[PDB]
Design a protein around this nucleic acid. Structure first.
Ligand SMILES: CC(C)C[C@@H]1CCO[C@@H]2[C@H](CN[C@@H]2C(=O)N[C@H]2[C@H]3O[C@H](SCC/C=C\[C@H]2C)[C@H](O)[C@@H](O)[C@H]3O)C1
Ligand SMILES: [K+]
Ligand SMILES: [Mg+2]
Ligand SMILES: [Mg+2]
Ligand SMILES: [Mg+2]
Ligand SMILES: [Mg+2]
Ligand SMILES: [Mg+2]
Ligand SMILES: [Mg+2]
Ligand SMILES: [Mg+2]
Ligand SMILES: [Mg+2]
Ligand SMILES: [Mg+2]
Ligand SMILES: [Mg+2]
Ligand SMILES: [Mg+2]
Ligand SMILES: [Mg+2]
Ligand SMILES: [Mg+2]
Ligand SMILES: [Mg+2]
Ligand SMILES: [Mg+2]
Ligand SMILES: [Mg+2]
Ligand SMILES: [Mg+2]
Ligand SMILES: [Mg+2]
Ligand SMILES: [Mg+2]
Ligand SMILES: [Mg+2]
Ligand SMILES: [Mg+2]
Ligand SMILES: [Mg+2]
Ligand SMILES: [Mg+2]
Ligand SMILES: [Mg+2]
Ligand SMILES: [Mg+2]
Ligand SMILES: [Mg+2]
Ligand SMILES: [Mg+2]
Ligand SMILES: [Mg+2]
Ligand SMILES: [Mg+2]
Ligand SMILES: [Mg+2]
Ligand SMILES: [Mg+2]
Ligand SMILES: [Mg+2]
Ligand SMILES: [Mg+2]
Ligand SMILES: [Mg+2]
Ligand SMILES: [Mg+2]
Ligand SMILES: [Mg+2]
Ligand SMILES: [Mg+2]
Ligand SMILES: [Mg+2]
Ligand SMILES: [Mg+2]
Ligand SMILES: [Mg+2]
Ligand SMILES: [Mg+2]
Ligand SMILES: [Mg+2]
Ligand SMILES: [Mg+2]
Ligand SMILES: [Mg+2]
Ligand SMILES: [Mg+2]
Ligand SMILES: [Mg+2]
Ligand SMILES: [Mg+2]
Ligand SMILES: [Mg+2]
Ligand SMILES: [Mg+2]
Ligand SMILES: [Mg+2]
Ligand SMILES: [Mg+2]
Ligand SMILES: [Mg+2]
Ligand SMILES: [Mg+2]
Ligand SMILES: [Mg+2]
Ligand SMILES: [Mg+2]
Ligand SMILES: [Mg+2]
Ligand SMILES: [Mg+2]
Ligand SMILES: [Mg+2]
Ligand SMILES: [Mg+2]
Ligand SMILES: [Mg+2]
Ligand SMILES: [Mg+2]
Ligand SMILES: [Mg+2]
Ligand SMILES: [Mg+2]
Ligand SMILES: [Mg+2]
Ligand SMILES: [Mg+2]
Ligand SMILES: [Mg+2]
Ligand SMILES: [Mg+2]
Ligand SMILES: [Mg+2]
Ligand SMILES: [Mg+2]
Ligand SMILES: [Mg+2]
Ligand SMILES: [Mg+2]
Ligand SMILES: [Mg+2]
Ligand SMILES: [Mg+2]
Ligand SMILES: [Mg+2]
Ligand SMILES: [Mg+2]
Ligand SMILES: [Mg+2]
Ligand SMILES: [Mg+2]
Ligand SMILES: [Mg+2]
Ligand SMILES: [Mg+2]
Ligand SMILES: [Mg+2]
Ligand SMILES: [Mg+2]
Ligand SMILES: [Mg+2]
Ligand SMILES: [Mg+2]
Ligand SMILES: [Mg+2]
Ligand SMILES: [Mg+2]
Ligand SMILES: [Mg+2]
Ligand SMILES: [Mg+2]
Ligand SMILES: [Mg+2]
Ligand SMILES: [Mg+2]
Ligand SMILES: [Mg+2]
Ligand SMILES: [Mg+2]
Ligand SMILES: [Mg+2]
Ligand SMILES: [Mg+2]
Ligand SMILES: [Mg+2]
Ligand SMILES: [Mg+2]
Ligand SMILES: [Mg+2]
Ligand SMILES: [Mg+2]
Ligand SMILES: [Mg+2]
Ligand SMILES: [Mg+2]
Ligand SMILES: [Mg+2]
Ligand SMILES: [Mg+2]
Ligand SMILES: [Mg+2]
Ligand SMILES: [Mg+2]
Ligand SMILES: [Mg+2]
Ligand SMILES: [Mg+2]
Ligand SMILES: [Mg+2]
Ligand SMILES: [Mg+2]
Ligand SMILES: [Mg+2]
Ligand SMILES: [Mg+2]
Ligand SMILES: [Mg+2]
Ligand SMILES: [Mg+2]
Ligand SMILES: [Mg+2]
Ligand SMILES: [Mg+2]
Ligand SMILES: [Mg+2]
Ligand SMILES: [Mg+2]
Ligand SMILES: [Mg+2]
Ligand SMILES: [Mg+2]
Ligand SMILES: [Mg+2]
Ligand SMILES: [Mg+2]
Ligand SMILES: [Mg+2]
Ligand SMILES: [Mg+2]
Ligand SMILES: [Mg+2]
Ligand SMILES: [Mg+2]
Ligand SMILES: [Mg+2]
Ligand SMILES: [Mg+2]
Ligand SMILES: [Mg+2]
Ligand SMILES: [Mg+2]
Ligand SMILES: [Mg+2]
Ligand SMILES: [Mg+2]
Ligand SMILES: [Mg+2]
Ligand SMILES: [Mg+2]
Ligand SMILES: [Mg+2]
Ligand SMILES: [Mg+2]
Ligand SMILES: [Mg+2]
Ligand SMILES: [Mg+2]
Ligand SMILES: [Mg+2]
Ligand SMILES: [Mg+2]
Ligand SMILES: [Mg+2]
Ligand SMILES: [Mg+2]
Ligand SMILES: [Mg+2]
Ligand SMILES: [Mg+2]
Ligand SMILES: [Mg+2]
Ligand SMILES: [Mg+2]
Ligand SMILES: [Mg+2]
Ligand SMILES: [Mg+2]
Ligand SMILES: [Mg+2]
Ligand SMILES: [Mg+2]
Ligand SMILES: [Mg+2]
Ligand SMILES: [Mg+2]
Ligand SMILES: [Mg+2]
Ligand SMILES: [Mg+2]
Ligand SMILES: [Mg+2]
Ligand SMILES: [Mg+2]
Ligand SMILES: [Mg+2]
Ligand SMILES: [Mg+2]
Ligand SMILES: [Mg+2]
Ligand SMILES: [Mg+2]
Ligand SMILES: [Mg+2]
Ligand SMILES: [Mg+2]
Ligand SMILES: [Mg+2]
Ligand SMILES: [Mg+2]
Ligand SMILES: [Mg+2]
Ligand SMILES: [Mg+2]
Ligand SMILES: [Mg+2]
Ligand SMILES: [Mg+2]
Ligand SMILES: [Mg+2]
Ligand SMILES: [Mg+2]
Ligand SMILES: [Mg+2]
Ligand SMILES: [Mg+2]
Ligand SMILES: [Mg+2]
Ligand SMILES: [Mg+2]
Ligand SMILES: [Mg+2]
Ligand SMILES: [Mg+2]
Ligand SMILES: [Mg+2]
Ligand SMILES: [Mg+2]
Ligand SMILES: [Mg+2]
Ligand SMILES: [Mg+2]
Ligand SMILES: [Mg+2]
Ligand SMILES: [Mg+2]
Ligand SMILES: [Mg+2]
Ligand SMILES: [Mg+2]
Ligand SMILES: [Mg+2]
Ligand SMILES: [Mg+2]
Ligand SMILES: [Mg+2]
Ligand SMILES: [Mg+2]
Ligand SMILES: [Mg+2]
Ligand SMILES: [Mg+2]
Ligand SMILES: [Mg+2]
Ligand SMILES: [Mg+2]
Ligand SMILES: [Mg+2]
Ligand SMILES: [Mg+2]
Ligand SMILES: [Mg+2]
Ligand SMILES: [Mg+2]
Ligand SMILES: [Mg+2]
Ligand SMILES: [Mg+2]
Ligand SMILES: [Mg+2]
Ligand SMILES: [Mg+2]
Ligand SMILES: [Mg+2]
Ligand SMILES: [Mg+2]
Ligand SMILES: [Mg+2]
Ligand SMILES: [Mg+2]
Ligand SMILES: [Mg+2]
Ligand SMILES: [Mg+2]
Ligand SMILES: [Mg+2]
Ligand SMILES: [Mg+2]
Ligand SMILES: [Mg+2]
Ligand SMILES: [Mg+2]
Ligand SMILES: [Mg+2]
Ligand SMILES: [Mg+2]
Ligand SMILES: [Mg+2]
Ligand SMILES: [Mg+2]
Ligand SMILES: [Mg+2]
Ligand SMILES: [Mg+2]
Ligand SMILES: [Mg+2]
Ligand SMILES: [Mg+2]
Ligand SMILES: [Mg+2]
Ligand SMILES: [Mg+2]
Ligand SMILES: [Mg+2]
Ligand SMILES: [Mg+2]
Ligand SMILES: [Mg+2]
Ligand SMILES: [Mg+2]
Ligand SMILES: [Mg+2]
Ligand SMILES: [Mg+2]
Ligand SMILES: [Mg+2]
Ligand SMILES: [Mg+2]
Ligand SMILES: [Mg+2]
Ligand SMILES: [Mg+2]
Ligand SMILES: [Mg+2]
Ligand SMILES: [Mg+2]
Ligand SMILES: [Mg+2]
Ligand SMILES: [Mg+2]
Ligand SMILES: [Mg+2]
Ligand SMILES: [Mg+2]
Ligand SMILES: [Mg+2]
Ligand SMILES: [Mg+2]
Ligand SMILES: [Mg+2]
Ligand SMILES: [Mg+2]
Ligand SMILES: [Mg+2]
Ligand SMILES: [Mg+2]
Ligand SMILES: [Mg+2]
Ligand SMILES: [Mg+2]
Ligand SMILES: [Mg+2]
Ligand SMILES: [Mg+2]
Ligand SMILES: [Mg+2]
Ligand SMILES: [Mg+2]
Ligand SMILES: [Mg+2]
Ligand SMILES: [Mg+2]
Ligand SMILES: [Mg+2]
Ligand SMILES: [Mg+2]
Ligand SMILES: [Mg+2]
Ligand SMILES: [Mg+2]
Ligand SMILES: [Mg+2]
Ligand SMILES: [Mg+2]
Lengths: 275, 48
RNA sequence: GAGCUAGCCCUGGCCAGGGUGAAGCUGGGGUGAGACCCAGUGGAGGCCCGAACCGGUGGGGGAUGCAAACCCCUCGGAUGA
RNA sequence: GAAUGCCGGCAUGAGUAACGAUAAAGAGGGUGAGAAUCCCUCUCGCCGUAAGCCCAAGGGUUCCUACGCAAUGGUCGUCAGCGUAGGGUUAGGCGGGACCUAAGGUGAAGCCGAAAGGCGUAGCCGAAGGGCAGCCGGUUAAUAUUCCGGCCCUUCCCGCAGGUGCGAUGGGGGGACGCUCUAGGCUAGGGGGACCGGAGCCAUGGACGAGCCCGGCCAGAAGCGCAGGGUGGGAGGUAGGCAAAUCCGCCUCCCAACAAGCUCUGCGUGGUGGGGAAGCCCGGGUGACAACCCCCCGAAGCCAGGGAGCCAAGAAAAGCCUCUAAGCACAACCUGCGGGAACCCGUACCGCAAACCGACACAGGUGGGCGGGUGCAAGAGCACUCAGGCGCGCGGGAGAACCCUCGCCAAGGAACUCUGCAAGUUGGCCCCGUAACUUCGGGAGAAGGGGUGCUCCCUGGGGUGAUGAGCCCCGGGGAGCCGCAGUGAACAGGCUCUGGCGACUGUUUACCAAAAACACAGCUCUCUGCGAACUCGUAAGAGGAGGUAUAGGGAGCGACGCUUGCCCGGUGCCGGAAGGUCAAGGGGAGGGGUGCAAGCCCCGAACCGAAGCCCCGGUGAACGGCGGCCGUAACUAUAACGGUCCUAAGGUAGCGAAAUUCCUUGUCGGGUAAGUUCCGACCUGCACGAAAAGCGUAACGACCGGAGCGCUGUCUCGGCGAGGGACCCGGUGAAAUUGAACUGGCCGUGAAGAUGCGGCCUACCCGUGGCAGGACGAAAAGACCCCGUGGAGCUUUACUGCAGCC
RNA sequence: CGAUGUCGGCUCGUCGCAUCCUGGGGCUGAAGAAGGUCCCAAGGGUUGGGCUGUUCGCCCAUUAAAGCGGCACGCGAGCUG
RNA sequence: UGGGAGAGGGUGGUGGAAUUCCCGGAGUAGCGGUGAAAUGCGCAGAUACCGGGAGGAACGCCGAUGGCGAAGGCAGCCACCUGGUCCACCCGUGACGCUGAGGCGCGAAAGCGUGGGGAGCAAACCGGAUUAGAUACCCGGGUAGUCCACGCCCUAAACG
RNA sequence: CCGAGGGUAGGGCCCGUGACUGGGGCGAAGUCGUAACAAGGUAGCUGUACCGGAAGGUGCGGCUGGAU
């Protein structure tokens, strides 16, 4: 439930914030945090390669366990649900009966005190991780590997999920968060349930300053520039596009497909996204 | 107002210094050129 | 050549005083339970007034200058992008 | 002899401007060849959140002393940051190194690139961050946490004693962290004292006083006390912490729990060691056996790694502690005590400035700390002052115009002007009171008003203490006094009505534009399934992102409200296994050259053969576009209606003489005595119109319009006064410009605007203060305009290539 | 074109006369008063304001009158902008 | 107290028919549509047929002149939570009743806000016919919406 | 002291009036179409929504005050 503010400043009028009601622990696990080297959008040449980045709040990176087949059969308790500034989802602190402590991204409905486990034999319950081939068709799933042992890759953002549609040989058929129908190898692990914090999408940033907090520097329209800078630059007064709308680098930006044609994974995409 | 020369001994040594010049084909030709001309100082003087 | 200037990165520092009085919390009222109302508490904010600090609105002066952009009066921001 | 030629010298302007903040000077006495300018004394003024003091950078001997005055110093100079010489910087504890890591840099392994080189895990380097042991006083002309004195402390080596499974670059704990707000106790700092110590003072009408004036502390080991921070104890299991582990993590059990204990800081006390004023006398000495005490205020600093709340979720590594591994247990480590050892660099001086950055001893720029008192509600604001520091390195006169900065003004009160530009007015606090409209927050300091000093009397509550007195902090009521006036000086909104634009706080053309421009939350389209798209790179490799469609890239629109119509023929983009075209290649009907011939060599048709293009569809918050003529109603007028041509389709809602309306000051209404502007309407919209968004919109604005009130030197219409200049005298002394000049007026003439030619007229020679009509005055080889088969930035369905992509 | 600064205003005037007023006249379809028209005359005078950047023009209130033009569309080493 | 009937309400699950789209097969010259047509679709292989998949919405027969609810209204099946109501017994309380200005709650459809969903249907809108016109009726397309959640709206031939 | 009233400032209610604009009533023989009354030639009416010179049309749901 997003939280509103009374309009006691111009910006508080529309600003909304998360309720943070699922959170039970408010400083991270010291053995699981490392510094997050801010880039500012600069590569190893020093060059800006992603425009408009920098100056957001300082953050520590929380190491997340995206394998889970690392510890087959070893159950764990859910000790805490915590805030993670590096992702939209919340994260869940796991205490294994091993004594090992790990973070996973917190699925919708997970409760502190419940137990999660991973493996081919796991109960089909929220928080458990199995290879895709052992999960019953129709199960809503998240944190899905794309190739075996390579790490969870799909459906990690707040509120997302993938749905198991069918089986074909060594492969299961998933509906990705985007609506694409894809074949993913059955040995790939995935976690039962959807990702939590589904109210994420309804947060209203409220003011320009709030975008600055997130490391998002102001974005300049092409039409505000000069011809040295952009296809849309220049003109006396305002100006329509006057050409097919383009990016700073000349390529078209209203419809032009850009997935590489001869890509080997095309053999595994059943149907492109819609809507 | 604030002018363009704002001296800084560390900046001067790390930018124009002898060891900065030797680390680079261009810097080494500067040292080669300034020797051939007979410069008394091959590199700006910095107190350190 | 980024010791000027522009952006970003790491690590530090600074922002007198005064004003306004959000949520929440407590109590009271209300109701089937509620919403909600009232009081107190509370101390939020690209909130208000105003130094430092950062600016440069209008006018006057200056114009072989004190100054290759300055001076006076006035004016903007001042917990924040 | 000319090149706005080059180098140099010297003129002119000229004894001209100027001599660098309007904080300010006067006199006496020294010194000396010489003194407004150096030294000393007294008087005066200026700064005092500095114009005082202390760090850091940067500077580099500028420091102190003697001897000097050619040049430097905007004048002078006996002086100096200047010349010459001599002297001066002292550390185990302060800062940096022999410690640690951050970005970044470098880089065994490894990867890439014609060469040069580019990358890169560990490792290394890298600090104003982490870690680490010194406080007070004295001393020099000049250094001092450095020398000395006092009291303290750290590490290394060795030895002695006692203890212990000792041992690490390996495991673990810790180090270790945000923003706002904030408790208790303290310290720094400050105010008062009728108490304590002090040289003295009684003036000019009065006071010998509970008088005046001055001071009343600082450091400190163990111990002790007050206030805080950190921290559970035992056992059993164990598969995790990349070997091991008795450590850490996880499970169970018992005991403890706002505690206590243990530990670690801060503050107080504390052996002891220091300091110690006014005044007087010559930095010193005295005062002095100085006294060193009570009360109140009180931090933003300390206890600290404290507490609460919030979301944007807040470094690393070493020191340190613990665990074990080889190893070794005659060792080694821990604890206590003792002796010994303890290196390199910095240290002078300036440091908001005459020593740094600005060519200058330049009204500019420069990070951190301290920054006293009183009063004004507070405060780092404002005025005056302390400590301390200055009067700004030309002066003396005069009292014109004119200029600057400032003060006042009869009557009027915006009549000024592009415009109330500018300047008035208003102005703090307390109280009363406050409209449309609104997104219910606001609008709001709305508007508008009343109060404000001092004296006496009574009285309420709080802090400290003791519950009291004293001190301190918030008040309430009554009666009076004086002035023109009580935020009596200084600092401190003029207000209202109504349009346009932009929602808003923000951002911008460093140095003519701050805006209506950019950004902005928000809305939509689109691309992207992850070795993502996209971006930088020849590549490797990076960013994206240690992210994964509630995400990331691109584009337009720009809070919010109500909305966003019709056209897919052209261009773009998306889809389409057909058909057409199509390159290399395949194929080889059929020719040709040469040879005696086997052969060798060459040309080569049909046909097969990708992307692209043609073709068929889709698509508008993709590029874009959204008609003409003629007729028609029972007064007229106008056409709901009709006819026909054309189109891919013919502009919907809303708005409209507009930031758009040419004709135009359209017409009508409002406001005014009068209104090319303004506001409200109309609609024949030259040439509005729906995300290059359409129409509204509370709040906001150093934006741009229009009006009114208040008040004014803006004005009628100017007058007087102040200071800094201008002017005169002494000192120092520029500049652009300059063919040479013995350089008048009119009417003519002349390359068409004559001091210079003609004719006339006028005119003794040379200056000083002033004014700007001319010298087609100066400055700048016109930036407008054209010309040059000159240049550059930019665009595209101009040409031709290339990257990239297919 | 190795620069003759350009609209309007302000300030300061000065000149011409094809005279707006005032003075002197003739004719009148001049009774008087008041006009019309032409002639002589440049001595002096020729207002304040609303609108617009305006010159110009319209309008308000007056007036004896509210003249037209030249002086680089007078005048930026005089100001404004 | 003991019983009963019921699409009364809320939550979650789940079952088959059909439509549509997608893939595979087989197959050829039309299909569709009307009063008749045309637009549209189809040799780039449609229609008709078989197998497979995806998804949303509504629940045939039972079904009725039926049942339930105060009304609006409620229909596959299952479980859970919950309201009203009737009958039997004649056991308990002892008039505790009726109505009800205001108030509060519920209130079909359409509509509105923020998300989701979207098969079929379908305002607007496009096209084809018809007609003098045809901004209609009829035909082919088609967007809101119809569906779910939460929050608004509060109307009706909300009628017996 | 109070005090008629006068002054300054800001509110509330009513009345009159206003360029222009909105629909309404009425008016012997105007223009356009034909929505309703017959199944009125698409049964009608209805709340709502959207559209159209105009009556109206269409969607969704409701009513019979509908016919055969
Ligand atoms: C219609 C109009 C376009 C005609 C046009 C008017 C423009 O000028 C005039 C041209 C004719 N030449 C004139 C001119 O060049 N004038 C120069 C001035 O430059 C500055 S004055 C500030 C700048 C103004 C003007 C500059 C262009 C110097 O001081 C002056 O000496 C003078 O050189 C005509
Ligand atoms: K031009
Ligand atoms: Mg809000
Ligand atoms: Mg949460
Ligand atoms: Mg760590
Ligand atoms: Mg990164
Ligand atoms: Mg690097
Ligand atoms: Mg980018
Ligand atoms: Mg960037
Ligand atoms: Mg993310
Ligand atoms: Mg999170
Ligand atoms: Mg796979
Ligand atoms: Mg969002
Ligand atoms: Mg952030
Ligand atoms: Mg953004
Ligand atoms: Mg933008
Ligand atoms: Mg532009
Ligand atoms: Mg531009
Ligand atoms: Mg560029
Ligand atoms: Mg270009
Ligand atoms: Mg371009
Ligand atoms: Mg353009
Ligand atoms: Mg433009
Ligand atoms: Mg334009
Ligand atoms: Mg532009
Ligand atoms: Mg165009
Ligand atoms: Mg383009
Ligand atoms: Mg591309
Ligand atoms: Mg896809
Ligand atoms: Mg600067
Ligand atoms: Mg600098
Ligand atoms: Mg340095
Ligand atoms: Mg440095
Ligand atoms: Mg440096
Ligand atoms: Mg630097
Ligand atoms: Mg370098
Ligand atoms: Mg170097
Ligand atoms: Mg080389
Ligand atoms: Mg070499
Ligand atoms: Mg030499
Ligand atoms: Mg060099
Ligand atoms: Mg370089
Ligand atoms: Mg820099
Ligand atoms: Mg920089
Ligand atoms: Mg501040
Ligand atoms: Mg404050
Ligand atoms: Mg107040
Ligand atoms: Mg309060
Ligand atoms: Mg609370
Ligand atoms: Mg503020
Ligand atoms: Mg200024
Ligand atoms: Mg001014
Ligand atoms: Mg200048
Ligand atoms: Mg200034
Ligand atoms: Mg000022
Ligand atoms: Mg302010
Ligand atoms: Mg402040
Ligand atoms: Mg010659
Ligand atoms: Mg010469
Ligand atoms: Mg030359
Ligand atoms: Mg020369
Ligand atoms: Mg020369
Ligand atoms: Mg010479
Ligand atoms: Mg010379
Ligand atoms: Mg000379
Ligand atoms: Mg001379
Ligand atoms: Mg002269
Ligand atoms: Mg001068
Ligand atoms: Mg000067
Ligand atoms: Mg001054
Ligand atoms: Mg002054
Ligand atoms: Mg004197
Ligand atoms: Mg004197
Ligand atoms: Mg002297
Ligand atoms: Mg002398
Ligand atoms: Mg002097
Ligand atoms: Mg002296
Ligand atoms: Mg004297
Ligand atoms: Mg002071
Ligand atoms: Mg120097
Ligand atoms: Mg000298
Ligand atoms: Mg001399
Ligand atoms: Mg001399
Ligand atoms: Mg000199
Ligand atoms: Mg000087
Ligand atoms: Mg002498
Ligand atoms: Mg000499
Ligand atoms: Mg010295
Ligand atoms: Mg020492
Ligand atoms: Mg050593
Ligand atoms: Mg290191
Ligand atoms: Mg280094
Ligand atoms: Mg290092
Ligand atoms: Mg350090
Ligand atoms: Mg140290
Ligand atoms: Mg010490
Ligand atoms: Mg000595
Ligand atoms: Mg000392
Ligand atoms: Mg941390
Ligand atoms: Mg830190
Ligand atoms: Mg924060
Ligand atoms: Mg102390
Ligand atoms: Mg005090
Ligand atoms: Mg173990
Ligand atoms: Mg003594
Ligand atoms: Mg502080
Ligand atoms: Mg602390
Ligand atoms: Mg590190
Ligand atoms: Mg042994
Ligand atoms: Mg031990
Ligand atoms: Mg050594
Ligand atoms: Mg020293
Ligand atoms: Mg300064
Ligand atoms: Mg100095
Ligand atoms: Mg320079
Ligand atoms: Mg000076
Ligand atoms: Mg200076
Ligand atoms: Mg004091
Ligand atoms: Mg005050
Ligand atoms: Mg002076
Ligand atoms: Mg000064
Ligand atoms: Mg001076
Ligand atoms: Mg004089
Ligand atoms: Mg006076
Ligand atoms: Mg006056
Ligand atoms: Mg007035
Ligand atoms: Mg007045
Ligand atoms: Mg005016
Ligand atoms: Mg005037
Ligand atoms: Mg103006
Ligand atoms: Mg105005
Ligand atoms: Mg004031
Ligand atoms: Mg009002
Ligand atoms: Mg009000
Ligand atoms: Mg108003
Ligand atoms: Mg309003
Ligand atoms: Mg309100
Ligand atoms: Mg008030
Ligand atoms: Mg007031
Ligand atoms: Mg009073
Ligand atoms: Mg008094
Ligand atoms: Mg009196
Ligand atoms: Mg104010
Ligand atoms: Mg704005
Ligand atoms: Mg703007
Ligand atoms: Mg706007
Ligand atoms: Mg708006
Ligand atoms: Mg601000
Ligand atoms: Mg500028
Ligand atoms: Mg500029
Ligand atoms: Mg510039
Ligand atoms: Mg300016
Ligand atoms: Mg501008
Ligand atoms: Mg501004
Ligand atoms: Mg801009
Ligand atoms: Mg905006
Ligand atoms: Mg929006
Ligand atoms: Mg969207
Ligand atoms: Mg590239
Ligand atoms: Mg490339
Ligand atoms: Mg290469
Ligand atoms: Mg990464
Ligand atoms: Mg984006
Ligand atoms: Mg906006
Ligand atoms: Mg914008
Ligand atoms: Mg509204
Ligand atoms: Mg089209
Ligand atoms: Mg098309
Ligand atoms: Mg097209
Ligand atoms: Mg077109
Ligand atoms: Mg076009
Ligand atoms: Mg419409
Ligand atoms: Mg109009
Ligand atoms: Mg308009
Ligand atoms: Mg227009
Ligand atoms: Mg025109
Ligand atoms: Mg017009
Ligand atoms: Mg016009
Ligand atoms: Mg007019
Ligand atoms: Mg009027
Ligand atoms: Mg205007
Ligand atoms: Mg008209
Ligand atoms: Mg556009
Ligand atoms: Mg436009
Ligand atoms: Mg507005
Ligand atoms: Mg507004
Ligand atoms: Mg603004
Ligand atoms: Mg503004
Ligand atoms: Mg006005
Ligand atoms: Mg005056
Ligand atoms: Mg004077
Ligand atoms: Mg004289
Ligand atoms: Mg002289
Ligand atoms: Mg001299
Ligand atoms: Mg000269
Ligand atoms: Mg001559
Ligand atoms: Mg001569
Ligand atoms: Mg002469
Ligand atoms: Mg003459
Ligand atoms: Mg001529
Ligand atoms: Mg002449
Ligand atoms: Mg002559
Ligand atoms: Mg001559
Ligand atoms: Mg002659
Ligand atoms: Mg002559
Ligand atoms: Mg002559
Ligand atoms: Mg003459
Ligand atoms: Mg003279
Ligand atoms: Mg003169
Ligand atoms: Mg002249
Ligand atoms: Mg002149
Ligand atoms: Mg001249
Ligand atoms: Mg000339
Ligand atoms: Mg001239
Ligand atoms: Mg010039
Ligand atoms: Mg030239
Ligand atoms: Mg030229
Ligand atoms: Mg030029
Ligand atoms: Mg130019
Ligand atoms: Mg030309
Ligand atoms: Mg040519
Ligand atoms: Mg030619
Ligand atoms: Mg050319
Ligand atoms: Mg170029
Ligand atoms: Mg070029
Ligand atoms: Mg190439
Ligand atoms: Mg010219
Ligand atoms: Mg010249
Ligand atoms: Mg010139
Ligand atoms: Mg008569
Ligand atoms: Mg005359
Ligand atoms: Mg005018
Ligand atoms: Mg003119
Ligand atoms: Mg005109
Ligand atoms: Mg004239
Ligand atoms: Mg002319
Ligand atoms: Mg002129
Ligand atoms: Mg001028
Ligand atoms: Mg002018
Ligand atoms: Mg001139
Ligand atoms: Mg001239
Ligand atoms: Mg075929
Ligand atoms: Mg579907
Ligand atoms: Mg009974
Ligand atoms: Mg309803
Ligand atoms: Mg049609
Ligand atoms: Mg027909
Ligand atoms: Mg649909
Ligand atoms: Mg019924
Ligand atoms: Mg009276
Ligand atoms: Mg009908
Ligand atoms: Mg009919
Ligand atoms: Mg009908
Ligand atoms: Mg009909
Ligand atoms: Mg219709």
């Amino acid at each position: 439930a997003v939280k509103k503010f009374k309009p006691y400043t111009p910006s508080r009028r529309f600003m909304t914030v998360a309720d943070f009601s699922e959170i039970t622990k408010t400083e991270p696990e010291k053995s699981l945090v490392k510094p997050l080297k801010k880039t500012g959008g600069r590569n190893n040449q020093g060059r800006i390669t992603v425009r408009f980045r920098g100056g957001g709040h300082k953050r520590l990176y929380r190491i997340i366990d995206f394998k889970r087949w690392d510890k087959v059969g070893i159950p764990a308790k859910v000790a805490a649900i915590e805030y993670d500034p590096n992702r939209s989802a919340r994260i869940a602190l796991l205490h294994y009966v091993d004594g090992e402590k790990r973070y996973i991204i917190a699925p919708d409905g997970l409760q502190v005190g419940q137990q999660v486990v991973a493996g081919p034999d796991a109960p089909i319950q929220v928080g458990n991780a199995l290879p895709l081939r052992f999960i019953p068709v129709g199960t809503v799933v998240h944190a899905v590997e794309l190739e075996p042992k390579k790490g969870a890759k799909l459906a990690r953002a707040a509120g997302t999920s993938a749905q198991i549609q069918g089986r074909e040989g060594d492969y299961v058929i998933l509906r990705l968060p985007s609506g694409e129908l894809r074949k993913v190898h059955g040995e790939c692990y995935a976690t039962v349930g959807a990702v939590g914090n589904a109210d994420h999408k309804n947060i209203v940033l409220g003011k320009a300053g709030r975008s600055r907090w997130l490391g998002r520097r102001p974005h300049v329209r092409g039409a505000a520039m000069n011809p040295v800078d952009h296809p849309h630059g220049g003109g006396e007064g305002r100006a329509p596009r006057g050409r097919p709308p383009a990016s700073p680098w000349g390529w078209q930006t209203k419809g032009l497909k850009t997935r590489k044609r001869r890509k080997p994974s095309s053999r595994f995409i059943i149907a492109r996204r819609k809507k | 107002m604030k002018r363009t020369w704002q001296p800084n001994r560390r900046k001067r040594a790390k930018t124009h210094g002898f060891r900065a010049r030797m680390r680079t084909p261009g810097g080494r030709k500067v040292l080669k050129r300034r020797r051939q001309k007979g410069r008394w100082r091959l590199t700006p003087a910095v107190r350190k």
